[PDB]
Amino acid sequence: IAQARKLVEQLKMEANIDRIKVSKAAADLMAYCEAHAKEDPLLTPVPASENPFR
Amino acid sequence: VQLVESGGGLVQPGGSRKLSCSASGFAFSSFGMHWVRQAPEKGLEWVAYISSGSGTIYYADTVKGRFTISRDDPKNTLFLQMTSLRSEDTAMYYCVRSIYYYGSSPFDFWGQGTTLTVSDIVMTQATSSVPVTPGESVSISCRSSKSLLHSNGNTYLYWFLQRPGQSPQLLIYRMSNLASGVPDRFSGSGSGTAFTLTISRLEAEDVGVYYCMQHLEYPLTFGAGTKLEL
Amino acid sequence: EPPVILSMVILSLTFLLGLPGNGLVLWVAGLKMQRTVNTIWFLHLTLADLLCCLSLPFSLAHLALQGQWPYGRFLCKLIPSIIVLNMFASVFLLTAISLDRCLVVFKPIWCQNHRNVGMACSICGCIWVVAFVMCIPVFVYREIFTHNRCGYTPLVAITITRLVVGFLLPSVIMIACYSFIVFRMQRGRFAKSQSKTFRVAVVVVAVFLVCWTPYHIFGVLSLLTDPETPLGKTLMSWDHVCIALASANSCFNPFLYALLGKDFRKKARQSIQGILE
Amino acid sequence: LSAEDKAAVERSKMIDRNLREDGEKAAREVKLLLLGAGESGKSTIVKQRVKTTGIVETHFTFKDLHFKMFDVGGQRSERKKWIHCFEGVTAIIFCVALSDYDLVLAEDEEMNRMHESMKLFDSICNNKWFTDTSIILFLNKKDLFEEKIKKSPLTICYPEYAGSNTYEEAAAYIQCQFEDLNKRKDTKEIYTHFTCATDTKNVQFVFDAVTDVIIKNNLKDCGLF
Amino acid sequence: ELDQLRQEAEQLKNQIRDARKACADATLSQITNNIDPVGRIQMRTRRTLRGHLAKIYAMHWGTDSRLLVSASQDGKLIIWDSYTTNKVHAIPLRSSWVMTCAYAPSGNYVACGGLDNICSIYNLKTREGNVRVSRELAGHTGYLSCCRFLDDNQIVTSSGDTTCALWDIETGQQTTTFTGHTGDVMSLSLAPDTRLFVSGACDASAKLWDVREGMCRQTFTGHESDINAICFFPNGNAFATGSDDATCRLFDLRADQELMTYSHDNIICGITSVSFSKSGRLLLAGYDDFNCNVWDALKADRAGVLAGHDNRVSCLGVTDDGMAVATGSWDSFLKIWN
Ligand SMILES: Cc1cc(C(c2ccc(Cl)cc2)c2ccc(Cl)cc2)sc1C(=O)N[C@@H](CCCN=C(N)N)C(=O)O
C-alpha cells in the first residue's frame, strides 16, 4: 500500500549514493590510526607523573 | 536568593549580642556559611565558618573563645552568639553563602549586613586608591605571603568588589574564573604570590573598593583594599 | 601425658583449620559483600574467632612449658583475659544470631519495617561491652604464686555467673529459638514438607553444646570437690582439654554460620577462584 | 588537601549518608509485578504519573506493610527488553481470567484463551531472572466460569478433564493445570487464590503470601531453608 | 499493486548488494597485515566508584574528562569526580526505571530516561544551589533506550517504539521524528560533527540519519541478532556495532558496508557496550560474561581484557582526552581503568 511506496522510495534513495572502494577506506582508517598513535594514552602508557589516575 | 541580617545595634563593652540571618530562595542546608566583619574604617575581615551539615567549624584568632556560629536548617537561619564584646568588635557583619564541590563558586552571594557598635597568609594591596576615567583599562595588583597555588593545580585567590553603599559582590574565584552575572570585562591572572585583576573598557558603577582574598587555608585572609574612583 | 598431648593436638588443629577459614570469611564478608544486617553478625563473630585463633599460639606455648611461661604479673593478668573475652563474645554473638533469626520468623512485618544495620551495630557493641564485663574477673583475680604459676578470691560466684550467663541462658535461648523456627515454619497454611531447617538447627545446636558443655561441667565439678582428692588430680588436666575443646568452637563457627548461606558460599568461591587464577 | 578539597570531601560524605538512608527507606517496600495475558482481569484486581508509560505504580499500605505494585501493560515491546529490570521483586502477581476458556479474543491455534495464559505463565515462572521469585496466582471471574461450565464443558480446551461438570472440580482442574507449569517446585512457590470479588480476602491473601515469601527469603538467605 | 512494488523492492535491494560487492576491493586484513600488533594491553583499575545501591544501567563522561554521570535502578543520578572519587551531585528520579543518561557537552545539564517513556532534563547550574528538573520530553510511545545532547537546547533520543526523535528543549516538542526501523531502537551514537547520527535496533540493522534533513541516509545489515551497542570511529567515517550474537562489527560510511568482525570461539555472550580509543586503534567492548575485551580494531585480535565486574558489564566509556576508561556493571560499581 503506502508502506510499499515508502520502502521503494527509501531503497531508491539509498541506492544512488556514491561509494569509495574498501581499500581506500581501510587505508584512511589506518592513516588516522598512525597519525594519532603517539598521543593515545591507552596504547603506550604515559609516565605516572602525567597520569591523573594514580 | 536573599540573605537578610538582623540583630545589630549598640552594645556596651563586655556585653553579649546575637546576630541572626534569614535565608530564602535557595537550598540553605547544602551551603556552608561565613560570618565576615568590616570595620567602619578598614576593609573586610573573615570571622567564622560553619560547614553544610554542621561539621567543621572555623573561627578567626581574634574571636575564638568568645564567638559561636550555629545554624538552624529547618528554619533556614544562621546564628552568631558573641560574648564579652570589646570596642574592637564594632563593625558591619555580613553573612556569605559558599558551596564547595568540583567547579563551584564559593562566596557567590552576600547579605546586606548588620551594624554593631560598641602561619597566616598575608595579602598586600600595592595601591589603596587610584584615579580612573570611564572607557579606560585599569590593573589592580595583589601579593601573597606564600604561594596560593596548590599541588592539585589551582590557585585559591578570590577577587571581590564593594560598590559604595552595598555589600561585596564576587568578581573572580580561583584567580581566573569569572563569576555568574559578571560582565566579560574583568580578567584575573598571575602566578603564586603575584596576581593582577584587569578591567578593560571601564565605566560608571565600577567605582568602589576591590579586595583580594585567599582560600588556600584557614584563617581566610583579605587584602587591604584598592579603591577606584572617577 | 595423654591429656596434654590431646590438648596440644586439639589446639594445633583448631588453629591451622580456623585461621585460614576465619581470615577468608572475614575478608569476603568485609571487602566484597554489601553491608546487610545478616553480615554484621558474621563480621563480629569472625572477628572474635580470629582473635581467639591468633591467641591460640600463646596458649600452646603456655601448655608447652607446663605453665611457668609468663614470668610476670601483667602477662598473666592480660592474655587469659583477652582469650576469655573473645570466647564469651563469640557465645553472645551466637545467641544474638539465633534471636535475630527467631525474630524475623516470628515478626516478619516488624522486621521488614524496623530492621536496619544501625540496630545490629548497637547490639554488637553492647555484646562486646557485656563480654568485657564478664572478662574483668580474670584480670582482677588472676595472680602470680610460687615452681611458679599464675592462677586463682570468690571463685564460687565467678563460676556460677560464668555457667549461668555464658552457658545456661544462651543455650536455652538458642534451643528455644531454633525449636520455634522448625515447628513455626512446619505448621503454616503454606507449609512445605522440608528437612533442611531441622538438620541445620540440630547441627548448629549440637556443635555448640558439644564444644561448650564439658567446659562448664568441669567448671562446676571443680567447685564441688577438694583439689587434693585424687578425683581432683585427675580432673586438673581434663580441665585443660575441656578448655581446648571450648576454644575449638571458634574454628567450627565459620563453616556453620557464614558458609551455610548460598550468597556467601558463591561469593567466597568466586573470590577464591579469582585469587588462585 | 586544601580547604576547598576538604569541604568537597565533606560534601561527598554527606551525600553518601543521604544515599544510605534513602536505600534503607526504599528497602522497606514490598515490590510486586503485575502480569497477565490479554483481557485477564488484572485491571479489576489492581482496582480491588502515567500517560502511555506502562510502568503504572500503585503504592498502598496493608497492616503496616508498604506495597509498590508495578503494572507494565502499557509497554508494547517484547518482555525480554525490560523484564530484567524487575529481577529482584518480592513477588509476581499473575492474573488469569478463569471464566474465559471458550472465547478466543486473541491470536490462538484453533479456539482458546487459556492457552496463551498457560504460555505466559510458563515463560514467566520458568525464566532466568525469576529463578526464585514467587508467584501469587489469581483466578478471576469464578461465577462467570460457573455458569459457563454449567452450559459448556472444559473438554473443548481441556481434553484430559474427567469428572462431572462441577464448579469445584473444574476450578481445581485449572488449579492443577496452571500450578504444574512450574519446573522448579523445589525453589519457588505458587500461591493460588480464587478471586472473591465480593470480599476483601484478595488483599488479605496477598498479604499472607507476601509474609510467607518474606519469611522464606530471610530463612533461605541464611541457609536455614 | 503490492506484488509489483515488492518485486521492485527486491530488485532495488539486489542492486544495492551488487554495488556494495563491486565496491569491496580488499578487506581491512590484507592491507593491515604489515601493521605491527599492539601486543598485550594491560590496564589496571585506578578508581572504584561506590555508592549506587542497585545495578548501574548507564554512564556518560563529561567533556572535561573528569566528571561523569551514572544512572542506577535505585532511582538516582550521581555525578563523580573521577580524580578524587568524590560524588558531586545526587539527583533523585521521579521514575526509578532508568535505562539511559547523557551529559551535556557544556556541563550545565544532564538527561535521563527509561520505562516511563519520558526524557527528563535536569539543570546542574542553578542559583538556588540544587539540581532541579528543567524539562520533561514526552511523546515517545515506548521506553527510552538512549539519549545524547546535540547542544544545550537540542537532544536526540531513541525509544522502544521503533523511532528516534530530535527535540528542541526550549519548547519541549520534538522537531524531527526518524522512522524506518522495524524493531525497538536500542542504541544511539552522534558523529563528532553532530551533522549525522547512527542508530542500532532490534531488527539487527543500523541506520545513519541526517539530523537536519530528518531522513535515513544509509542502512547497514550484517548482524545476526539485536544490536545493543553502537559507537562512531573518531574520524567519523566508520562506526562499530555490538550485538547479542557475541560479535562486534565495523562499518565504513563511505564504503557503505562492513569492514571487520571482532569475535572469538570462547566468547558466547552478547555485547552490552562498545567504545573506541582516542586514536581508534583499540575497540573496547563489554560483555555479559562479566568483563570487557580490548580488541585491536585494525587487526581484529584480542589485545587485552578488563576483568573487574562480579556482574554483567552494562556500560563503558572512554574520556575525551583518552586517558581512562570507565565501566559500570550490574554489581553496582563503577571502575576506572588506566
Ligand atoms: C580461657 C582460658 C585459657 C587458659 C589457659 C590455656 C588455654 C588453652 C590451653 Cl590448650 C591450655 C591452657 C591459658 C593460660 C594462660 C595463657 Cl597466656 C594462655 C592460655 S585457662 C582459661 C579460663 O577459662 N580460665 C577461667 C576458669 C578456668 C577453667 N574453668 C572451667 N573449666 N570452668 C578463669 O580464669 O576463671
Helix (H/G/I), strand (E/B), else coil: B45: strand
Q: Which of C15, C141, C243 best tests ligand 1's pocket when mutated (most atoms within 8 Å of CB)?
A: C243
Q: Hey, what's the cell of E235?
A: 574520524
Residues facing E154 on adjacent strands? E168
Q: Residue C74: what are its φ and ψ, rounded to 5°?
A: -70, -45
CA distance A12 to A10: 5
CA-closest residue to ligand 1 atom 27: C219
Distance C38 CA to ligand 1 centre (A): 31
Give the domain CATH number at A35: 4.10.260.10
Residues facing B186 on adjacent strands? B199
CA distance C111 to C109: 5
* Domain tally, chain A: 1
Q: Hey, what's the cell of D4?
A: 576547598
Residue recorded with cell 560533527: E193
CA distance B180 to E16: 55
| Number of Cβ atoms within 10 Å of the Cβ of C74 | 9
Terminal-to-terminal C-alpha distance of chain E = 60
3-state SS, one letter per residue, for chain E? CHHHHHHHHHHHHHHHHHHHHHHCCCCCCCCCCCCCCCCCCCCCEEEEECCCCCCEEEEEECCCCCEEEEEECCCEEEEEECCCCCEEEEEECCCCCEEEEEECCCCCEEEEEECCCEEEEEECCCCCCCCEEEEEEECCCCCEEEEEECCCCEEEEEECCCEEEEEECCCCEEEEEECCCCCCEEEEEECCCCCEEEEEECCCCEEEEECCCCEEEEEECCCCCCEEEEEECCCCCEEEEEECCCCEEEEECCCCEEEEEECCCCCCCCEEEEEECCCCCEEEEEECCCEEEEEECCCCCEEEEEECCCCCEEEEEECCCCCCEEEEECCCCEEEEC
Distance C62 CA to ligand 1 centre (A): 10
Domain that holds residue B137: 123-228
Strands D56-62 and C143-145: unpaired
CA distance E189 to E168: 18
Q: How far is CA E156 from CA B228, D52, E103, E104, E280, in A?
A: 50, 20, 13, 12, 24
Residues facing E69 on adjacent strands? E60, E79
Q: Residue A19: closest CA among chain E residues belongs to which residue?
A: E255
Mark whether B114 and B17 lie in a shared domain: yes
Query: Which of B118, B151, B171 is the last residue before a domain boundary?
Result: B118
Q: Residue C46: what are its φ and ψ, rounded to 5°?
A: -65, -35
Contacts of E286 (CB under 8 A, 6+ apart): E271, E272, E273, E274, E292, E312, E313, E314, E315, E316, E327, E329
Q: Is the CB of C215 inside a 6 Å radius of any atom of ligand 1?
A: yes
Query: Which of B118, B137, B156 is the last residue before a domain boundary?
Result: B118
C101 in reach of chain D (CB within 8 A): yes
Domain that holds residue D37: 1-225
Q: How far is CA C227 from CA B21, C147, C217, in A?
A: 78, 18, 16
* Chain B residues 46-75 with a CB less than 8 Å from chain D: 51-53, 55-56
Strands B226-229 and B129-131: parallel
Cis peptide before C70 (omega within 30 of 0): no
CA distance D138 to D133: 16
Q: Hey, what's the cell of C202?
A: 540440630
Strands E215-220 and B77-82: unpaired
Mark whether B15 and B106 lie in a shared domain: yes
Chain E: residues touching B (Cβ < 8 Å): 66-67, 81, 84, 86, 88-89, 107, 125, 127-130
Domain that holds residue A35: 1-53
Residues facing E242 on adjacent strands? E229, E248
Question: Half-sphere exposure of E162 toward its Cβ, with a 13 Å CA cutoff?
Answer: 12
Sign of CA dihedral E32, E34, E35, E37: positive
E80 and E67 Cβ atoms separated by less than 8 Å = yes
**What burial letters (b/e) apply to E148-173, b meaning 16+ CB within 10 Å?**
bbbeeebbbbbbbbbbbbbbebeeee
Give the domain CATH number at B174: 2.60.40.10
Terminal-to-terminal C-alpha distance of chain C = 45
* Domain tally, chain D: 1
CA distance E199 to E164: 8
Mark whether B80 and B179 lie in a shared domain: no
DSSP B164: T
DSSP string, C81-101: HHHHHHHHHHHHHHHHHHHHH
Distance C221 CA to ligand 1 centre (A): 16
Q: Do B55 and D5 touch (CB under 8 A)?
A: no
CA E175 from chain centre, in angstroms, equals 22
B226 and B128 Cβ atoms separated by less than 8 Å = yes
CA-closest residue to ligand 1 atom 9: C59
D116 and D37 Cβ atoms separated by less than 8 Å = yes
E56 and E72 Cβ atoms separated by less than 8 Å = yes
C192 in reach of chain D (CB within 8 A): yes
Residues facing E223 on adjacent strands? none
Q: Hey, what's the cell of E175?
A: 522537531
Strands B114-117 and B91-98: antiparallel
Sign of CA dihedral E119, E125, E126, E128: positive
Helix (H/G/I), strand (E/B), else coil: C145: strand
Mark whether B98 and B131 lie in a shared domain: no
Exposure of A26 by Cβ count < 10 A (0-12 exposed, 13-18 middle, 19+ buried)? buried
Q: Residue A10: closest CA among chain E residues belongs to which residue?
A: E216
CA distance C104 to B102: 44
- This entry's atomic model was obtained through cryo-EM
CA distance E158 to E148: 9
Put the strands of the sheet holding B186-191 in their side by side order: B123-125, B138-144, B194-199, B186-191
Give the domain CATH number at D49: 3.40.50.300
Put the strands of the sheet holding E109-114 in their side by side order: E98-103, E109-114, E118-123, E132-138
Sign of CA dihedral C6, C11, C16, C22: positive
Residue recorded with cell 577577587: B159
Which residues of D are known binding-site members?
Answer: 39-44, 49-52, 71-75, 140-143, 197
DSSP B40: S
CA distance E135 to E118: 10
Q: Residue E58: what are its φ and ψ, rounded to 5°?
A: -150, 155
Which among E53, E73, E75 has the least Cβ separation from residue D85? E73
Architecture of domain E1-338: 7 Propeller (2.130)
How do the domains of chain E map onto residue ranges?
Answer: 1-338
